[PDB]
Amino acid sequence: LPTAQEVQGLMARYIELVDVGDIEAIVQMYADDATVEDPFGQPPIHGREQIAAFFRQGLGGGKVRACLTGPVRASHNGCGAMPFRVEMVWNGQPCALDVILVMRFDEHGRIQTMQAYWSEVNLSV
Amino acid sequence: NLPTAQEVQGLMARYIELVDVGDIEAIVQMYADDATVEDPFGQPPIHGREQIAAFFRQGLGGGKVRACLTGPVRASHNGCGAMPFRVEMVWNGQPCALDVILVMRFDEHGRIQTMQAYWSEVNLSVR
């Protein structure tokens, strides 16, 4: 069960993995039976196979940039939240998306649940 | 009347305004009667307006707390939103800043049903 400082580290690395687009390293940060709700409000994705398919589709050939826009907030029960921005172009016009991610880690330092808050009101193009 | 994403951004932005001014009463008014609060997340939750009101009395009550948004409010389509903000106050006899992230869920009447605040000592900064 990751300490507060370890959570900050695990989460910062996660944005780094998204920014570079290493899909396989991203999937390995998740527990084998992790759950993903992105966007929060829609039905959750379950398991690495489904999570992998989700990322291969989203970060696939997309060429995306992602960066923390503020410090990672972490608690003492293996949970944390962070604000970040996702930028693309694919259309000639710069597009941005502001998101806040909430994660709960397990006793092995793997992501058990992940929830991303954002909607169309967070798009800026 | 479950708030839309845009209404959530408004409600949450308003919440911080009240915390800044210090209107403790206007804040408790925003919570539903059987609302739940977890601040900081990881601690046992407080149930009911009574406890909640008692809670804010202790915290915001004593101390000239200051607070501002540090980024836009993220909002879902099912009455939930999350936002990042900073709190400024006097900690253990020193000027300090606290970086926080709040997660809220509203009910069918625009009242806060659940509130969870993420922060720890790792989010504490001097001056």
Contact between A83 and B84 under an 8 Å Cβ cutoff? The reply is yes
DSSP-H helix ranges across chain B: 5-21, 24-30, 48-56
Contact B70/A at CB under 8 A: yes
CB contact under 8 A, A117 and B6: no
Way the structure was solved: X-ray
Q: Do B120 and A77 touch (CB under 8 A)?
A: no
- Give which of B101, B105, B107, B106 is closest to B122, Cα–Cα: B101
CA A12, A34, A105, B118 torsion-angle sign: positive
Domain count, chain A: 1
Q: Which residues of B touch A82 (CB under 8 A)?
A: 101
Give the domain extent around A103. 1-125
Cβ distance B80 to A120 less than 8 Å, yes or no, reads no
Residue with tokens 């009240």: B18
Q: Which of B41, B68, B119 to mutate to test the interface with A (most CBs of A within 10 A)?
A: B41
Before B40, cis peptide (omega within 30)? yes
* Resolution, Å (one decimal): 2.2
Cβ neighbour number for residue A125 with a 10 Å cutoff: 9
Flag whether residue A76 sits within 8 Å of chain B, measured between CB atoms: yes
- φ, ψ dihedrals at B62, nearest 5°: -80, 120
The position carrying tokens 């503020």 is A70
From residue A76, alpha-carbon distances to A5, A11, B90 in Å are: 9, 15, 22
Residue indicated by tokens 């608690």:
A75
Cβ atoms within 10 A of the Cβ of A69, count? 17
Is A124 in CB contact (< 8 Å) with chain B? no
**Which residues of B form the catalytic set?**
15, 39
Per-residue buried b or exposed e for A76-97, using 16+ beta carbons within 10 Å of the residue's own CB? bbbbbbbbbbbebeeeeeeeeb
Residue with tokens 């800044």: B20
Residues in chain A: 125
Which of A7, A1, A114 has the alpha carbon at shortest distance from A71?
A7
Residue B6 CB contacts under 8 Å (≥ 6 apart), including other chains: A121, B75
Beta bridge partners, B86, equal: B68, B99
Other Cβ atoms within 10 Å of A40 Cβ, number? 25
Tokens for B127? 């001056």
Give chain A positions within 8 Å (CB) of B83: 100
What is the token pair recorded at A82? 């962070």
Mutate to test the interface with A, among B77, B122, B123, B125 (most CBs of A within 10 A): B122
Tell me the shortest Cα–Cα distance from B84 to chain A, in angstroms: 7
Q: Which residues, listed in sequence order, are joined to residue A100 by a DSSP beta bridge?
A: A83, A117
Question: Cα dist. B114→A120, B56, B57, B95, B117 in Å?
Answer: 23, 15, 19, 30, 10
Tell the burial category of A63 from Cβ atoms under 10 Å away from its Cβ (0-12, 13-18, 19+).
Answer: exposed
CA–CA distance, B29 with B39 (Å, rounded to integer): 18
Helix (H) or strand (E) holding B35: strand B31-38
> Given CB atoms, is B38 within the 8 Å cutoff of chain A?
no
SS3 content of chain B, % helix, strand, coil (to 5): 30, 40, 25
User: What Rg do the C-alpha atoms of chain A give, in angstroms?
Assistant: 14
Can you tell me the distance from the alpha carbon of A61 to that of A108, in angstroms, rounded to the nearest whole number? 31
CATH of residue B58:
3.10.450.50
Tokens of A59: 């970060």
Distance CA A68, CA A98 (A): 10
Shortest CA gap A63–chain B (Å)? 23
Tokens of A70: 């503020």
The DSSP result for chain A, as a single string, is ---HHHHHHHHHHHHHHHHHT-HHHHHHHEEEEEEEESSBTBPPEEHHHHHHHHHHHHSSS---EEEESSPPEE-SSSEEEEEEEEEE-TTTS-EEEEEEEEEEE-TTS-EEEEEEE--GGGB--
Backbone angles phi, psi at B100, to 5 degrees: -130, 160
Which residues of chain B neighbour A120 with C-beta distances below 8 Å?
A: 5
